[PDB]
Design a protein around this ligand. Structure first.
Ligand SMILES: CCCCCCCCCCCCCCCCCC(=O)OC[C@H](COP(=O)(O)OCCN)OC(=O)CCCCCCCCCCCCCCCCC
Ligand SMILES: CCCCCCCCCCCCCCCCCC(=O)OC[C@H](COP(=O)(O)OCCN)OC(=O)CCCCCCCCCCCCCCCCC
Ligand SMILES: CCCCCCCCCCCCCCCCCC(=O)OC[C@H](COP(=O)(O)OCCN)OC(=O)CCCCCCCCCCCCCCCCC
Ligand SMILES: CCCCCCCCCCCCCCCCCC(=O)OC[C@H](COP(=O)(O)OCCN)OC(=O)CCCCCCCCCCCCCCCCC
Ligand SMILES: CCCCCCCCCCCCCCCCCC(=O)OC[C@H](COP(=O)(O)OCCN)OC(=O)CCCCCCCCCCCCCCCCC
Ligand SMILES: CCCCCCCCCCCCCCCCCC(=O)OC[C@H](COP(=O)(O)OCCN)OC(=O)CCCCCCCCCCCCCCCCC
Ligand SMILES: CCCCCCCCCCCCCCCCCC(=O)OC[C@H](COP(=O)(O)OCCN)OC(=O)CCCCCCCCCCCCCCCCC
Ligand SMILES: CCCCCCCCCCCC(=O)OC[C@H](COP(=O)(O)OCC[N+](C)(C)C)OC(=O)CCCCCCCCCCC
Ligand SMILES: CCCCCCCCCCCC(=O)OC[C@H](COP(=O)(O)OCC[N+](C)(C)C)OC(=O)CCCCCCCCCCC
Lengths: 205, 506, 95, 28, 169, 491
């Protein structure tokens, strides 16, 4: 029998089997890669014009140096963003949806690919340390439900009757599991055995 | 009352001769004007009558119980600020004469108060543009009131340029909406809320975000608040936020009708970045006003989460938070102005230069405050602990009420990030307290006759001479005890915030 | 911006090169190197060097110091203590 | 003849802390 | 002299970039100062070829000179009004160290990884350590350019640093 | 009556000390009369206030019914409901008894500012004591975090050389972790509209939501016990904080985490607590084993005792997460027994040796029994109490906690018995060295234990042995309160 571990995951809408038309990973990555390279390269040559227009003004030169990108960053940034978009969509197609593990893998690999290009003069272990840190941040971003839970929020649940507006009643027992945001007075004992299993005080000793 | 009394003060100030006493007495007349303005406004505007929302002046303005509360808060905080220029902050002429040397100081404040109070009431795009200019222009004139100061003028130049770019963005957003619909009144535009481009209103919010110093536009406000005189920085860092944030809440109330989640994501991106910059930005700084500038950026991010969620729990969160944060802001700047009297005097490395506009400029000028004035040092500790969010101070309930509204709307990420942001910013909040007190025992038995306060004379050597003036001491005592003992009346105060409605009704 | 970026090694290095272009007895110049003895400058040669060292560092020796200067190190000390960048227009800094 | 106990590093690097050959004082 | 000529090309290139993009003024002073000492270096070592190790000792002297100047100023104060002379010395040390660490020579850890077995083996065969002069003897100061890839002076610093750690008196 | 009197009386005490000691600040430059003998009168008033606080809880103890199920003395004050049960009553009395001890331990070893220290001690004691009598989650959090403000300033003003490091550690480790516990409290108030203990105890939440709420709360609890790997703040804070700060930190502050499990986890998140127990046991067992082996290599006297506290509080965590009465009672008795022995060991190590020699390095001390025989008796006696030698309350707490773990999980709960061996390894390695060999060459002969330090040691030893021999004084009070925490459906 499987281990009964806690599952601390925020509610998400689950697509029915047969749903989830996949997204073209190469096509979507192409738009991010090309659009980023055009902007970053275009903004690079726009700033060179600002350099030529003025180089004896320290105020302009200081601000231009902050926004200046090295040659390896002008290539590495579009590649890292393109690989991110490709791998994020490729893993999402694999898993019939987007998961925090998929985003952690996509972000760390995309970071490591970019870091190995525009951070060549640093130890390899240093680039991996940043890539693990970068990948964890985006995995945490997906785990928290991106920028908002949306239809899975409690306010949304409360508007759909899936909250606790009506209160509780012990006489009512439901075979189906309660909603994520719903609380009940009494539960079927079969649900407890499904969650915890038998053993240390459930049913048997 | 404001408009009528401003005209008399404008003319009267130009008639009488120029002296420091006359300017100080004219400032006290400004204090009476705001008090009468508050009494008249309270006598006619009541929360129960304004719940529906009442149109005025051919529907150009719309006042409701949510707008009315902010107007009274603006008047009350403006009363506390005028006490700074209407009474002695330190009692020493070398420091206090600055507040009495500009006769147009009180006139500009009355000009700006009119703009501050009318801005949340705007009900038309034409009057929205006019009022946001009226508020902005007065802020520029106040930032440049000390025109013989190089830093004060440089700040006003930066303020004018950035605030004009934001105003053009605001104007460009309203012109786009008028082009789409051919309508100017907000309530008329609400009839077409489902057909106009909603991101035309995000452009309107973007111009408002610049004027409150939100990231990524935070750079200019951090620069301006640090370069301006402490008396100027006290006003300009707080007053624009009271009105603009209230207006942002009303605009976001209309935006939520169509429920555009793409717009919610862009704003969440700006809040997320501002939490990161507000917390990590203040870790390596040596100026107190630069530190407080990042504190302001951080607390605005907290309020914008309540504004973004925009629900019944958000009205209570925003209303309570804005009131308690204004009092904490007023209390901290009052203490910083006072404690310049404990500054040592030379009789040198790093060639540190301190000016008359900002005698307290570095965090380590707060050293040994626990020894010089224990009651004031504790008052500053209570305020800083409130910014940290230590219960049961007012700052704790502010973060608690913000989290409730944010988590109720599914903003899991922003609720976690702000709590991490609170922990990170605690590092530089604690550094203030470390400077105030941590060297008390290793310095208790030292001879410090080189302070600024020691330059003052003594009357008779048989009288008791208070070291701090009466009015400024009572204000610090009152605000500190309100921050400390809010637990006594928290239940009654939050029940009042339940009644403040923004078209809830039923 | 309006602060010096001078080091003692750069000022000495620039001083030596400017002094090398003159007709001096020795090209081996250090801080202790005197003008009259080691380099061999009369009244007029010394003041030609001082003005030449003025133009290089954009500094102006005061009359009291210039008349009483003996060594190369004294010049390096003077430049480090008195050098200020020239004020720029109202647009160079803020823009 | 006499040998050091186990788990005694042959080198270490702790900044400016003096570096010395490990001497088991029990054998003095 | 292939590495020396390649190294001096990057220093010249950074000078061209600095004038082009108006980079930090102090960096312009550093590169200009390096080139002048290189100009002196070429005169006194003609026909002898210029390995990067002889360039390494040139930048080492510049780094050590400014650190000594920085130490005095950061203790008794900088002479300029803005008190930036002491920090300017250390800022230049960073610029010089950037080029020093780009030369194809051994790092501090590689040189210490070869002298530390020698310092320890001296002390165990003799008991007490008094002067570094007993450690210079067991150093092959003839072939430390391709087996160790270090200059004559960088080994001297490594021994002196290690000696002060291991000295018993 | 209890909460209202305990707050009103102490505010009057706080205001009284401020009025007397601050009436002469105004360039009087006088010599006063209360400043004599290191502010003796102001110290004595604060000492009296601490004892009176113990009298207040007694008046409510006389009317306590050990055969009543539910909270008693239910009161409303400041719009908050306050109540007491068997578990809360004992923790309140433990908290208040340590109040006079904290003041008396620092009776004459402060460089100055005695009025500030006494107020902060009495302020810390009341806030911690009030944390056991609140009846909602928000009131629990308010009192949980309110202690950070005085504790942060207490360390930074009266602390040792590295006080700045220790003040930041306690403020940031505890505040950041508790904010995660605040997130769970906010969720409760959102979906249930109340944080009342009784109201939330009856609601069953979805098994996924119970997991998220458990993790939020356990983060705040795990840092404050502390457990591995978030324990690194405690050894730094204990070695630099003043003696009274170490006593309150080692006697009360750590026990709030166990009470957090009793209130915030067991009765409301009952289903998910059973799921998390193996994870809790693994973390706690490794906390016990790792802290014991790490304690061997320590060289600071006050840090050795700090790591000893972590090992025993891992055993308290193991017992409280046993789903039986034996483990729960054993964990509670071990909390009280630790609440006396651990402060005593800090007095011996950081209050007697440090006040004479001002050095906490282990290498300076040996053979102390030659010229400090009275110190050696108390050091040896408390060392055996600290290792759970029978006749001590520590053993009764440890044996029942280990037994409760074995009953809960026979396989992995048996590893808890390593507390018997490992605790004696590091504690008797330190004691065997302080009392062994010739009197140290680095020390000069000085006075032995004084009357004040004898008094402190005796009145921390006496409760430990009374509980050790007749724990039914405590188990009778806890019996009906502890039985409500058990979750099981036997068919
Ligand atoms: C004749 C040619 C005319 C060319 C006109 C454009 C001028 C050159 C500019 C380069 C192109 C970038 C802008 C493209 C339009 C703006 C983005 C957009 O609207 O999406 C278009 C493109 C395709 O997406 P699509 O699905 O077809 O559009 C929706 C259809 N229902 O979506 C994309 O994938 C565009 C690529 C965007 C991703 C790269 C940008 C992110 C990385 C760079 C960030 C730039 C700096 C950050 C700015 C924010 C700072 C706070
Ligand atoms: C196309 C032009 C480039 C795009 C610029 C975008 C500007 C707006 C974006 C918002 C950031 C506003 C901050 C101020 C803008 C920074 C201006 C800038 O680009 O300068 C680059 C700056 C200098 O870095 P430096 O490498 O020393 O200079 C280059 C030397 N050649 O390097 C920096 O320090 C920039 C980083 C500033 C800090 C921003 C951090 C925001 C938070 C990001 C993490 C969010 C945290 C949550 C993560 C969890 C979710 C995954
Ligand atoms: C830098 C690289 C360090 C490790 C990067 C992440 C590795 C952890 C991981 O989860 O690897 C899984 C990754 C793809 O992730 P996933 O979405 O789970 O694959 C589909 C499964 N059906 O598989 C990988 O390709 C990696
Ligand atoms: C002068 C202080 C006067 C306080 C008046 C507060 C006020 O405006 O009234 C309460 C207001 C609701 O008013 P409403 O019901 O709409 O109208 C009829 C009420 N009579 O409710 C509100 O909306 C008020 C919102 C702002 C509350 C600010 C609280 C200020 C706290 C006291 C200020 C500190 C006093 C320092 C003393 C210095 C003077 C020596
Ligand atoms: C002189 C007469 C005194 C005023 C009499 C009075 O009615 O005060 C109100 C209250 C008495 O209590 P009462 O309202 O009758 O009912 C209990 C609910 N608090 O008494 C009080 O409210 C006193 C409250 C002030 C003392 C507590 C201040 C806060 C202490 C720090 C918080 C501690 C908890 C965290
Ligand atoms: C200072 C040291 C202090 C002490 C340190 C800790 C020592 C105790 C650690 C071991 C825990 C106690 C061992 C008790 C387990 C023995 C119980 C037993 O009776 O064995 C059999 C039992 C099930 O009984 P049975 O009927 O035979 O199984 C068939 C069921 N139809 O269950 C079984 O089938 C066997 C269960 C596996 C036993 C694994 C034992 C190895 C544990 C290693 C821990 C890591 C090292
Ligand atoms: C270094 C610190 C200094 C302190 C060191 C010494 C500490 C004091 C030692 C005693 C510890 C206190 C525990 C005794 C307190 C009295 C407990 C008690 O209440 O006993 C009640 C007992 C049964 O109760 P009941 O039948 O209900 O009748 C009484 C109704 N009220 O009724 C009875 O029959 C009373 C019987 C009491 C017997 C005397 C107890 C004294 C201890 C001797 C026995 C200890 C156990 C033996 C251990 C020997 C070694 C293995
Ligand atoms: C510590 C808590 C970690 C939870 C475990 C988890 O979330 O596990 C790690 C997840 C896996 O999620 P997944 O593989 O997408 O989903 C699992 C499979 N499902 C779809 C069937 C469910 O990935 C990550 O790295 C996410 C990083 C989570 C960081 C959380 C920070 C702590 C916030 C505290 C909240 C009060
Ligand atoms: C139960 C709720 C109580 C709330 C009230 C708190 C006390 C108010 C003290 C004000 C008077 C004062 O600053 O007085 C100062 C007094 C006594 O200092 P002293 O040694 O005489 O000063 C020296 C004078 N000499 C030189 C003449 C001897 O310091 C105290 O009292 C300190 C108590 C507060 C410390 C913790 C601050 C935490 C802030 C956030 C709390 C959540």
């Amino acid at each position: 029998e499987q281990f009964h571990l806690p599952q601390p995951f925020w509610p998400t809408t689950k697509t029915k089997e047969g749903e989830y038309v996949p997204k073209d990973s190469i096509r979507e990555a192409s738009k991010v890669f090309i659009g980023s390279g055009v902007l970053l390269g275009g903004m690079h040559f726009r700033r060179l014009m600002q350099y030529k227009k003025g180089s004896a003004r320290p105020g302009l030169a200081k601000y231009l140096n902050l926004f200046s990108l090295s040659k390896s960053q002008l290539i590495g940034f579009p590649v890292a963003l393109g690989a991110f978009s490709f791998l994020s969509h490729s893993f999402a197609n694999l898993q019939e949806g987007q998961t925090a593990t998929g985003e952690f893998a996509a972000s760390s690999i995309a970071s490591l690919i970019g870091l190995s290009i525009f951070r060549t003069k640093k130890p390899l272990s240093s680039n991996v340390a940043i890539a693990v840190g970068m990948g964890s941040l985006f995995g945490f971003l997906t785990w928290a439900g991106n920028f908002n839970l949306g239809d899975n929020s409690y306010r949304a649940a409360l508007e759909a009757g899936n909250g606790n507006e009506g209160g509780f009643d012990n006489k009512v027992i439901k075979t189906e599991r309660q909603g994520f945001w719903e609380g009940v007075y009494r539960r079927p004992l079969s649900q407890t055995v499904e969650d915890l299993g038998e053993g240390r005080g459930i049913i048997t000793q | 009352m404001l408009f009528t009394s401003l005209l008399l003060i404008i003319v009267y100030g130009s008639l009488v001769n120029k002296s420091h006493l006359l300017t100080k007495l004219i400032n006290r007349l400004g204090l009476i004007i705001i008090i009468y303005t508050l009494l008249i406004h309270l006598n006619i505007n009541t929360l129960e009558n304004l719940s529906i929302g009442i149109n005025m002046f051919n529907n150009l303005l719309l006042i409701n119980s949510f707008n009315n509360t902010i107007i009274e808060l603006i008047l009350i905080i403006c009363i506390l600020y005028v006490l700074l220029i209407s009474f002695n902050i330190t009692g020493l002429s070398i420091i206090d004469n600055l507040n009495y040397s500009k006769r147009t100081f009180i006139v500009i404040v009355l000009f700006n108060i009119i703009g501050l109070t009318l801005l949340p009431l705007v009900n038309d795009i034409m009057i929205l543009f006019i009022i946001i200019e009226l508020q902005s222009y007065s802020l520029y004139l106040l930032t440049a009131i000390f025109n013989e100061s190089h830093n004060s003028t440089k700040s006003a130049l930066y303020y004018f340029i950035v605030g004009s770019i934001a105003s053009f963005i605001i104007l460009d957003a309203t012109v786009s909406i008028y082009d789409d619909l051919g309508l100017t009144n907000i309530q008329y535009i609400l009839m077409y809320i489902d057909k106009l481009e909603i991101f035309d209103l995000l452009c309107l919010l973007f111009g408002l975000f610049i004027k409150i110093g939100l990231a990524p536009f935070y750079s200019y406000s951090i620069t301006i608040y640090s370069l301006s005189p402490t008396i100027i920085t006290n006003y300009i860092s707080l007053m624009p936020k009271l009105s603009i944030l209230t207006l942002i809440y009303i605009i976001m109330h209309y935006i939520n009708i169509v429920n555009n989640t793409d717009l919610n994501y862009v704003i969440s991106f700006l809040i997320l970045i501002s939490m990161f910059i507000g917390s990590f930005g203040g870790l390596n700084v040596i100026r107190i006003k630069t530190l407080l500038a990042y504190s302001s950026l951080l607390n605005v991010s907290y309020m914008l989460l309540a504004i973004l969620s925009n629900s019944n729990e958000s009205i209570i969160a925003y209303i309570y938070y804005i009131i308690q944060y204004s009092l904490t802001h007023i209390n901290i700047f009052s203490i910083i102005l006072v404690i310049s009297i404990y500054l040592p005097i030379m009789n040198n490395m790093l060639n540190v230069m301190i000016t008359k506009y900002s005698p307290i400029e570095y965090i380590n000028q707060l050293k040994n405050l626990f020894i010089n004035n224990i009651f004031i040092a504790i008052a500053l500790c209570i305020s800083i602990f409130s910014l940290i969010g230590i219960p049961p101070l007012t700052g704790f309930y502010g973060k608690y009420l913000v989290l409730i509204s944010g988590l109720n709307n599914g903003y899991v990420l922003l609720s976690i990030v702000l709590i991490i942001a609170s922990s990170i910013s605690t590092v530089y909040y604690a550094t203030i307290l470390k400077v105030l007190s941590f060297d008390t025992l290793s310095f208790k038995d030292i001879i410090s006759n080189n302070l600024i306060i020691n330059t003052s004379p003594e009357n008779n050597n048989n009288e008791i001479k208070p070291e701090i003036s009466n009015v400024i001491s009572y204000v610090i005592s009152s605000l500190t005890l309100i921050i400390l003992l809010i637990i006594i009346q928290y239940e009654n105060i939050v029940k009042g915030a339940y009644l403040v409605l923004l078209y809830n009704w039923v | 911006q309006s602060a010096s970026t001078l080091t003692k090694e750069d000022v000495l290095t620039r001083s030596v090169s400017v002094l090398r272009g003159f007709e001096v007895k020795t090209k081996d110049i250090d801080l202790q190197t005197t003008f009259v003895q080691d380099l061999g400058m009369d009244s007029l040669d010394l003041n030609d060097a001082l003005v030449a060292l003025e133009e290089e560092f954009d500094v102006v020796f005061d009359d009291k110091t210039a008349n009483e200067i003996k060594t190369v190190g004294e010049v390096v000390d003077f430049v480090l203590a008195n050098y200020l960048p020239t004020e720029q227009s109202i647009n160079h800094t803020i823009r | 003849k006499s040998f050091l106990p186990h788990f005694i590093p042959k080198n270490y690097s702790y900044g400016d802390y003096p570096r010395l050959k490990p001497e088991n004082l029990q054998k003095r | 002299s292939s590495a020396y000529d390649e190294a001096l090309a990057t220093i010249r290139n950074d000078l061209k970039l600095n004038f082009r993009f108006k980079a930090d003024v102090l960096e312009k002073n550093v590169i200009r100062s390096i080139l002048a000492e290189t100009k002196n270096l070429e005169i006194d070592n003609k026909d002898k070829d210029l390995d990067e190790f002889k360039l390494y000792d040139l930048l080492s002297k510049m780094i050590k000179q400014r650190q000594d100047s920085a130490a005095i100023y950061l203790k008794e104060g900088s002479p300029d009004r803005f008190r930036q002379t002491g920090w300017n010395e250390l800022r230049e040390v960073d610029y010089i160290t950037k080029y020093l660490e780009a030369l194809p020579v051994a790092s501090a850890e590689e040189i210490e990884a070869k002298v530390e077995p020698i310092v320890q083996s001296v002390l165990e065969e003799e008991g007490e350590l008094k002067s570094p002069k007993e450690i210079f003897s067991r150093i092959p100061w003839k072939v430390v350019n391709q087996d160790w890839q270090a200059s004559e002076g960088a080994v001297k610093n490594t021994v002196l640093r290690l000696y002060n750690l291991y000295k018993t008196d | 009556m209890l909460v209202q009197n305990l707050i009103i009386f102490n505010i009057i005490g706080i205001v009284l000390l401020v009025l007397l000691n601050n009436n002469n600040n105004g360039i009087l430059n006088k010599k006063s009369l209360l400043t004599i003998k290191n502010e003796l009168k102001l110290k004595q008033i604060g000492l009296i206030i601490s004892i009176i606080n113990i009298l207040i809880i007694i008046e409510n103890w006389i009317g306590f019914n050990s055969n009543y199920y539910g909270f008693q003395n239910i009161e409303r004050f400041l719009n908050i409901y306050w109540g007491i049960d068997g578990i809360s009553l004992l923790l309140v009395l433990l908290t208040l008894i340590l109040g006079p001890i904290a003041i008396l331990s620092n009776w004459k070893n402060l460089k100055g500012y005695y009025t500030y220290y006494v107020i902060s001690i009495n302020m810390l004691v009341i806030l911690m004591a009030l944390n056991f009598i609140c009846l909602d989650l928000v009131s629990f959090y308010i009192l949980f975090e309110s202690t950070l403000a005085p504790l942060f300033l207490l360390i930074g003003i009266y602390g040792a050389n590295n006080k700045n490091k220790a003040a930041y550690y306690v403020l940031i480790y505890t505040l950041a972790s508790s904010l995660f516990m605040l997130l769970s409290i906010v969720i409760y108030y959102i979906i249930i509209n109340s944080t009342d203990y009784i109201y939330i105890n009856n609601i069953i939440l979805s098994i996924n939501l119970q997991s998220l709420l458990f993790i939020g709360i356990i983060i705040g609890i795990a840092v404050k016990t502390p457990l591995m790997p978030v324990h690194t703040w405690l050894p730094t804070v204990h070695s630099e904080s003043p003696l009274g700060g170490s006593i309150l930190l080692a006697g009360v502050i750590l026990k709030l985490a166990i009470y957090g499990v009793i209130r915030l986890l067991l009765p409301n998140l009952s289903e998910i607590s059973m799921m998390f127990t193996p994870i809790i046991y693994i973390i706690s067992i490794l906390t016990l084993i790792y802290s014991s082996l790490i304690t061997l290599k320590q060289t600071d006297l006050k840090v050795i005792i700090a790591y000893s506290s972590i090992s025993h509080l891992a055993v308290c965590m193991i017992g409280i997460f046993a789903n039986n009465l034996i483990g729960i009672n054993g964990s509670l008795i071990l909390c009280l027994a630790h609440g006396f022995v651990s402060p005593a060991l800090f007095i011996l190590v950081g209050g007697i040796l440090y006040d004479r020699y001002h050095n906490r390095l282990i290498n300076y001390y040996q053979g102390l029994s030659t010229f400090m025989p009275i110190f050696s008796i108390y050091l040896v006696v408390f060392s055996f109490c600290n290792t759970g030698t029978p006749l001590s309350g520590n053993f009764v707490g440890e044996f029942l906690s280990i037994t409760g773990a074995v009953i809960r999980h026979p396989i992995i709960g048996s590893l808890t018995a390593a507390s018997v061996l490992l605790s004696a390894c590091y504690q008797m390695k330190l004691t065997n060295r302080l009392t062994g060999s010739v009197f140290s060459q680095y020390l000069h002969i000085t006075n032995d234990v004084t009357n004040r330090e004898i008094f402190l040691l005796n009145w921390l030893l006496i409760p430990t042995i009374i509980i050790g021999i007749y724990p039914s004084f405590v188990t009778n009070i806890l019996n009906l309160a502890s039985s409500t925490l058990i979750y099981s459906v036997l068919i």
